[PDB]
């Protein structure tokens, strides 16, 4: 599962950034340090659902024009290998497993059990929110649903819960081969007005923090290391310069591959020496 | 003429072919019943043609022609006179 860090940044940034700019209360917390003049002018421009101006994000070397009033620019950056493992082995699995998901569900009333239903086959369960199923509950999984017994849990026919689970594909057990990669990626905000750039960079730092709690970040992209450059004129051949402070993001992740095993031993016969 | 020759048998295996379609077996289900068929003779699902394997499971399906398959690879040299 080769990880495209650049795609992950875009997937996380685009929704979360829109949400942050949507409300004003969060922005005030973010821009608490800045002076009144810069803070409100930025808020007057981009903040709120009724903002006429809008921010954009894209990758480098596009053949079209970007909104140079305010824009996030990304470029892939360097990559390095840091740590290996014996035989390049990472893990062994009895089931072909995909991504790890979080889903919300409501308990359903069966005869002997209360069951939750999920959009896909459960495979490996990880956690149901704030439930410590005892052995007498007899927690078990079946297809796309998870079940626990009804008795002495009868108040919970309407229980509303979140579920963390994995996507199951096949029963073909296999090994993992791969290593760890230390990758760096560059991000920069652009504007023809320096004050906007500083506000824009500060907004970015917050959502990077929020990404530390994300499922993908916690499981796949770990050990953030942020580095900020000096504010510089990106462009000078024009009616006015473009100013932007580049930032560098570092990640640790695994470049993994699945190796499938077919040599399943089932029979075992003992024969003594003829002598 | 031939100056030196040797024949070695790389593989001996049993392959499964449908009696109706004539397509060979490509993939099978949990109990080795067919889910996919393919026209390819060589890509077809195959297993070693050994007695122990037979006792270890032809058994499973009726639209089934269990065929034997053998591969011969030959190394030879010639000195072609003028």
């Amino acid at each position: 599962a080769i990880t495209s860090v650049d795609s992950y940044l875009l997937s996380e940034i685009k929704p979360r950034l829109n949400t942050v700019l949507e409300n004003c209360y969060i922005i005030d917390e973010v821009l608490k340090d800045f002076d009144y003049q810069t803070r409100e002018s930025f808020k007057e421009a981009f903040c709120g659902k009724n903002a006429q101006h809008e921010v954009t994000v894209g990758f480098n070397f596009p053949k079209f024009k970007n909104n140079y009033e305010a824009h996030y620019l990304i470029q892939l950056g360097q990559g390095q290998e840091t740590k290996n493992s014996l035989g390049s082995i990472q893990s062994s699995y009895f089931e072909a497993t995909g991504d790890t998901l979080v889903e919300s569900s409501t308990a359903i009333r069966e005869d002997d059990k209360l069951v939750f239903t999920v959009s896909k086959p459960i495979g490996e369960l990880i956690k149901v929110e704030d439930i410590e199923f005892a052995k007498y509950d007899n927690l078990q999984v079946e297809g796309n649903k998870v079940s626990f017994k009804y008795q002495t849990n009868e108040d919970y026919e309407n229980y509303n819960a979140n579920i963390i689970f994995t996507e199951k594909k096949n029963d073909s057990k296999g090994l993992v081969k791969g290593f760890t990669v230390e990758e760096q990626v560059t991000v920069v905000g652009l504007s023809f007005n320096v004050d906007v750039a500083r506000c824009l960079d500060a907004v970015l730092k917050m959502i990077l923090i929020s990404m530390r709690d994300s499922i993908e970040e916690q499981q796949t992209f770990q050990l953030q290391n942020l580095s900020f450059g000096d504010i510089a004129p990106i462009i000078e051949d024009g009616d006015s310069m473009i100013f932007g402070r580049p930032t560098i993001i570092k990640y640790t992740s695994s470049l993994d591959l699945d190796y499938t095993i077919t040599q399943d031993i089932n029979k075992l016969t003992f024969k003594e020496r003829k002598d | 003429s031939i100056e030196k020759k040797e024949e070695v048998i790389a593989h001996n295996e049993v392959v499964f072919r449908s009696l109706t379609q004539g397509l060979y077996v490509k993939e099978v289900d949990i109990y080795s019943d067919v889910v996919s068929y393919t026209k390819d003779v060589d890509e077809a699902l195959a297993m070693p043609n050994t007695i122990n394997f037979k006792n270890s499971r032809l058994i499973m399906n009726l639209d089934l022609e269990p065929l034997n398959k053998i591969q011969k690879v030959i190394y030879e040299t010639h000195l072609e006179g003028l």
Partner: protein
């Protein structure tokens, strides 16, 4: 481990054979049986002094 527990006296280490064939494996090995004490023959000689 058995020898360390005195359950077996001796055995050949190199005699073991293992063969694997698809889902089946064949194992062959040898161990020497223990031998008990059966016969004793005695003779006496009387002499002077």
């Amino acid at each position: 481990r058995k020898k360390r527990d005195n359950e077996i006296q001796d055995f050949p280490a190199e005699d073991v054979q293992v063969i694997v064939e698809g889902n089946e494996a064949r194992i062959s090995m040898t161990v020497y049986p223990i031998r008990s004490f059966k016969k004793i023959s005695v003779s006496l000689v009387y002499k002077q002094q």
